[PDB]
Amino acid sequence: ARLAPQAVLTPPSAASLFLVLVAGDSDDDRATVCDVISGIDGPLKAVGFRELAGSLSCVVGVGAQFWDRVSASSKPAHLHPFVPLSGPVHSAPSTPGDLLFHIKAARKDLCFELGRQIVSALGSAATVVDEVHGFRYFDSRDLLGFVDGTENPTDDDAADSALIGDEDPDFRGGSYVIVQKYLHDMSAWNTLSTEEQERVIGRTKLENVELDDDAQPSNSHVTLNTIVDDDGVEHDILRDNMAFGSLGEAEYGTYFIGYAKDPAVTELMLRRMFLGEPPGNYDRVLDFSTAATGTLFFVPSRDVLESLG
Amino acid sequence: ARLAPQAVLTPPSAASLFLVLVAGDSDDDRATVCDVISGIDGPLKAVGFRELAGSLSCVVGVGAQFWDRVSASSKPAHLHPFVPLSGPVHSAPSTPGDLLFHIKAARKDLCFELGRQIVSALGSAATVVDEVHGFRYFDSRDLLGFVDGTENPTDDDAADSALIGDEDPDFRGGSYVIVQKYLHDMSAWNTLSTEEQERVIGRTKLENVELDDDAQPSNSHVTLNTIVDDDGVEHDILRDNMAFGSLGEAEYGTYFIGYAKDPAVTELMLRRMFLGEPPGNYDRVLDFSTAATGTLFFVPSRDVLESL
Amino acid sequence: ARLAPQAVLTPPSAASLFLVLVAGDSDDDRATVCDVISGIDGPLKAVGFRELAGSLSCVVGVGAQFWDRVSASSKPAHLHPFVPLSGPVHSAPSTPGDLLFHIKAARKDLCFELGRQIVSALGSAATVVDEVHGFRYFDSRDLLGFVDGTENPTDDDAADSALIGDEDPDFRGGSYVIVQKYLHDMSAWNTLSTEEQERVIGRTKLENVELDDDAQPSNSHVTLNTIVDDDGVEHDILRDNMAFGSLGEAEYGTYFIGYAKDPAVTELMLRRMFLGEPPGNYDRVLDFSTAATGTLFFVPSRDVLESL
Amino acid sequence: ARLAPQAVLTPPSAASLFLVLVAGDSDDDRATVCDVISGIDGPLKAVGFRELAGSLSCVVGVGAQFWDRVSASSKPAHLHPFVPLSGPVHSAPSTPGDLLFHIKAARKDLCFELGRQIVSALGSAATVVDEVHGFRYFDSRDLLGFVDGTENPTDDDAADSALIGDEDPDFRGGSYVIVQKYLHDMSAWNTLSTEEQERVIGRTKLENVELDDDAQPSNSHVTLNTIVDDDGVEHDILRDNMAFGSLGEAEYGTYFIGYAKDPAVTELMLRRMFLGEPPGNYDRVLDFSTAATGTLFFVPSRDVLESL
Amino acid sequence: ARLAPQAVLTPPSAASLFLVLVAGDSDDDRATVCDVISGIDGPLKAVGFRELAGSLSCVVGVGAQFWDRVSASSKPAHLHPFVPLSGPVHSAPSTPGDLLFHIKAARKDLCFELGRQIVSALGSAATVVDEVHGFRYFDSRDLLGFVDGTENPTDDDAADSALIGDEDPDFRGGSYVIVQKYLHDMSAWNTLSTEEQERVIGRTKLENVELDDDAQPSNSHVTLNTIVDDDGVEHDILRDNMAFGSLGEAEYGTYFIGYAKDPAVTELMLRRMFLGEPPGNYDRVLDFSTAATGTLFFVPSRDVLESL
Amino acid sequence: ARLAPQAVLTPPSAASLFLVLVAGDSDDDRATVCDVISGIDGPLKAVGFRELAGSLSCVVGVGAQFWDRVSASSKPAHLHPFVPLSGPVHSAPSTPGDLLFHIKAARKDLCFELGRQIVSALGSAATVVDEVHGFRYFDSRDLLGFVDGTENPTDDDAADSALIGDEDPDFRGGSYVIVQKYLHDMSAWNTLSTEEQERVIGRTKLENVELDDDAQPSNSHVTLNTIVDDDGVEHDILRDNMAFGSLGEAEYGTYFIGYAKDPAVTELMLRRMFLGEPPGNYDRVLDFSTAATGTLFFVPSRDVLESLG
């Protein structure tokens, strides 16, 4: 899917950039934002064409509140702000954001350059509220030391899971994406043995093999994020998580970013993680990870994004 | 297609693992085997996701007999055990195999790791009967020194040639695969001149150009493996041949592996090779290569495989 | 795509070869040529399969006069010879060509070797009339110093821009290609400031960013090559331009090659460049670039090419 | 070199990490720090060996005050704290730093992971006072758009420029390094024409060609940073500058890091830049760049570091 | 060092071939062997030059006994057959070998081809006794899942550790190499917890960090293989260990290969491993790994090798 | 040897550029040429630094006649114009050239860009008389289809063979290089069988193995270019040959370029090839290859090159 905005199905990359911005309250601000995001193919190619491989991609997401400013009476079926959750000890806050740019490439300079051009074009019309420079960490691992992304659906399965279909024809090809910037307590996580960490996750650490059923805890990250409806049909999401961090401020992080054709799936996963199934049987990754943001965005298909205003 | 099992249409790779196994007669065995293969996506991703490029692939083949132990009520139009051939000079054996794992990656370690995890999860339920570690040799050559795989169908031609279509709709997306582990007589091949070797194969050696029509022997490997029907229509297979060997055992091999939507095509090629066309006019490649195995498998589509 | 002839939508490559040829007068010449181009998949795979990555591609174009010698039976709707243009300052000549081979690969040797096999196979039946060895120059730049190709359509847009569809169903999958070999006056170009060069092209030089609507001159290259119909729909072409040159001859060039499902789009860009829009307001790029060739070809789909 | 600490002469990399730290007051803090830096080869290999290519490097610098806490016994001839400069328009501050870790690799994860291990191992004994994640920007450019590093000495010239020799034999193989973290005023920079920017730097922008002697302004960055002794001998430094920034903070930076066997060379460049040569005639780069840090370190050879 | 035999100091590679041969008792044999190895540069270049990067290398080892058949009047200070070890629980055999070919490249095909040409040129004059195809496993790990080779000496440390110096001047540039083909008990190793495995090795598993001094078992592989003399001086070897295996035979191996300027260092390591220090306190790696071979060779400098 | 002019010992590359120029007769011309070549490190780094790998190299050679214009009374011991040879059917002509630029890199654009900058700086002061764009052809082969360069010395052996030592201390580190642009008769060469081609060369075609002694013809390319003096000491040269060609003008070529500390070795090789040993027993490669140029150049060390004028 070379140099085309809204390519949700892109495979993992060595570098990413996650930018979340809040749009200004004016009509000028709205119009500038609308010009930039609807012409996003411009800077995408301005930057990406310079690398022969064409690895650069950019997915634009729009928040529920800003969507209603730019497209009042045409609205994807499930667009709403992020639903915050409050467990006894761990919570998923809902944090501001009208615009998401999820940028991936084989190199840092390409992500940075595109972000620079996007930010420059928006000028005073929007403000960056969250910025994360993701990087691949060894053999596709996160900073907890586990391979992160293994069971992502691919090919047809990825399209089926991520992309709006016949349920909502006016927005076919779009998606819904949720982000959360997690920070880890590395000290506390290191007090665990490998075997305990594997029980927390649901897979072996080095070898990345799923624990067998008889050894798989009911509150493992894997068990809690396995979604099968009443009819026995599995429901998956597409994740593009990346490590990030700052050694001086002791930030070791995982940027969660998951796409679904219906955010009810992602939301159910989150509520299973934070609230438990059975109730109180929550995801122990959360003992070692604290979400600092939580925002949902609608990802319009190319055709819809280009029509805005 | 990234990290999806039963991806028959994958381009050539630097490394291969060909694993042929036989299943236990037991019923725990039938079940374990069934669990490992119907969930093969699991180990594929467990290993393959660790490589940024996601080059790892795995095609699972099921022998006719073991297919009957596991899906009795439904069977693909052309599933049967490998038809042995007994020709004038040369013979193709029919050797045992219930399960085929055709593994490819950019790296050896990925092939080995995936194999290791497949074998470990099968435990005592099945036994490795043939293991081949294939490798790319220079510019896509076999150990006979010819570029090997040149005329393979690609893209749409490849799908049409290898993948079960409207003609057997319950098994669309599947394929039939035949393997044969060939061992070469390197001394004997080396006593031929380049030009004689070219006559045997059907193409120039260094340049990999197909001989002119007037200079093309009627028993050249290329002529014998060219299939045209009565309407004038060509029928092709998709080969993923790799070299392999052991210097201490003086083994120098080409691992043959061919996919077709209908094994009749591959079987006819084998027939023209081993029996000759006209009869006795056989493939001289056979004078320097001996098939140590010979096994046919059904390659179920990913949907069919995941039900079991 | 992989090693398939007529792959119009291939992404940019490190190297390419542009070969333009005129065919001989005899019916023999016309048969040899038809034989070569209709079997072009042979040499394509013979060379291309030798590279693991399979980057080698080859698009064959056929000029209008030659097409009539071979298929007076049926014609693509827009096939005609290249139309010369005579502007107030610059002219685009129409120069001979019956056949185009547009060859791309990750490596020069692959392009060269494919060209070698093609030319050898054609022998006396054809003569090379123009030959250009294109190369990538830094971060996708032309020798004028500007990123060249930025706004090419990609993916579905590329197919909708370049590939013949419902409008001419007999030749669906084909395309039309125009080539022009441009030589630059480098010393003249360098007398301009970067800002002046930016106003000539329509984008900033290092950063490759389109000039704002109100800083875009009406005769900028970008402005003149923007084609918008009465219904507000933009019409794009697919360009595969490469740098070339010779330091001893002081030749510094850009080889233009542009594919479109309807060549009138490309032709209209050419007219607006050479004659200006409004008339007189011509493309200042032409003050530093002189086209030495100008030829139109029909690019038959694989099916149509293989039946010629 | 391969996975050896204090490899000053490594070529440029895709990624780097600049960590500046202040050590604690206690003798315990001074012992932990000495333990970590003297054993720095451990973490270097622990991380670095994991990459086949072995690109990971780590140069440890020690500030003058900290060096006295650890080796009041003997001092390198030119070790002193960074000298602040107060020019007519711009100033270079002297900011704290006892330790520098200058880490380079082909990959960000390697730099990050080495930094992680270093910081963890130091625990409470030290505090990170400045941290910069450098990255390569297109074809070796800084964020000002100019190729940055062109005239670095290489090979023998690099060793003669950067490495302590006969002049201070007790510390042979060591070096002296100055870091300054510069932030740019990008909107101001963009108001200049390319030609104006070229006159500020001393080279053409896209093509990276030194301006002719008679078009080179006397206050160009290149002119001011050319150091020629009375005997006509040029004295060069070794720079490993990288881009960095944060789009949300509008931070666009160049991290300066310059190695020399005698830091007076580097210091003299700094004085000529900030104060001008002649006085008043200062470097116009400083009109668009503000140094937020300024620190001098001694870079001990492996031997000396390993005995600390 | 490119395409030069006896390049002991080469960095790790993606692929290896370890070939151990015994020579014929005959005198034609002595001579043929002598011709093949003294001219080993020939085949090395014949194969290696075909790869642009020139990654192929070949170290030739000569057993003590065969060295006496071929260079009677001159012998290196420490050449002798491999000293077998018979410990409390575990034993290291002394297996036969006259010739060692330690081959490394970026690719398998280059290793195999070189091996093929070496074996072919030796003909009946010598017989392959052990053949191992080594491969890189993930991020420089052995099949026990630990990063393997981390603490290897590099650059000058590596030359000082592995290469014969002023202390045996007739053989400067040479080395002594010991091989041992280890096979692992994967089931048994898998019943240990990660933490127990870490205690056995001496380093953390995923992170490859060396255990703290207070947590470092006295029988950990690292402790046992740490050699410090009476003056306080450490002595190291250069290891080029690779993984290898066969899934059907359930073989999972680490091929040990260690180079030293003096085999006493390596022999002491082996002694501390197998016998323990204090006695009985042996290396628990040995509880999960069994040495199937054990052979010592002299690695002549390229000058010494080419005279024979 | 990163981005340093006169790096004679560089390993093979994917692309090369061979430029031969004749200097103008004036004093201005001489001075401009002298400025350009003595400052050659300038454009070398201006171009080469832009590629992270630093693969770009440039070796400057100076002809005997031009050397005497720029360095009248300091002269390397063996600098003379190319010695032409005249066999009964094949000849090695001596053709003009005062300057050689032998440029190598991993990419074409880098070779071309450096050549452009060099040519631009020389302006009217010199004229290109020969220009060849070399490329790697498959697995290090020439257009005859044989691996070409196999037995080149490497490392210490390469330094010993190519570079002036104690014999001529004032020019230590310099070298002497000879070029000849060969064109092949591809038709005639294809009428030979592989086995005959192997006898012409002295090695097997595909596998690149030296023919054994008992099968190695006395007029094979290998035999004729094997140089052993009376004392039994072998003398080698360092070659950087590359393919080149033009399909339209039916040019299929090999650019010969060989470096030696003493051109007597290269010259002896050439006379063995063209004249035979025994006499008339000439190199049969020459039945299929015709030299269109022949020029010798002195390659000054960096220090000597930078001192010129």
Ligand code: HEM
């Ligand atoms: C601290 C943040 C997180 C970390 C470190 C983390 C880590 C992991 C790891 C190591 C795996 C196993 C390999 C795989 O990707 O298949 C995994 C699986 C998964 N995680 Fe997360 N995760 C995080 C947050 C989340 C969140 C917030 C969600 C849901 C909204 C989520 C959903 C999933 C899903 C759906 C899977 C695949 C489960 C399966 O079907 O096997 N993760 N995660």
Ligand code: HEM
């Ligand atoms: C010792 C084992 C074999 C070797 C060494 C070998 C080698 C080759 C070579 C060098 C080529 C020409 C390049 C190419 O187009 O791929 C070729 C072509 C081919 N081979 Fe084989 N082959 C072997 C076994 C087989 C077998 C057992 C079959 C059939 C079951 C087969 C079917 C084909 C086909 C269909 C072609 C393409 C023919 C065309 O249309 O030109 N091969 N083989």
Ligand code: HEM
């Ligand atoms: C089954 C065979 C072996 C395995 C799996 C193995 C594994 C390892 C591992 C995982 C390490 C730590 C990483 C490193 O520094 O390389 C190591 C270190 C080392 N091994 Fe082995 N090893 C084996 C056999 C041997 C033998 C036979 C010797 C001696 C003859 C040896 C000598 C060493 C040495 C000297 C070190 C570095 C110690 C230090 O200074 O930290 N190893 N080995």
Ligand code: HEM
């Ligand atoms: C048409 C031009 C030429 C072609 C096609 C050619 C080709 C070859 C080939 C294929 C080889 C074998 C592999 C190797 O490089 O070691 C070779 C070797 C060699 N050639 Fe050439 N060559 C040409 C011109 C020359 C000239 C003019 C000279 C001497 C001035 C020369 C000197 C050598 C040398 C010294 C060797 C290595 C011989 C040895 O010690 O084994 N070549 N050449």
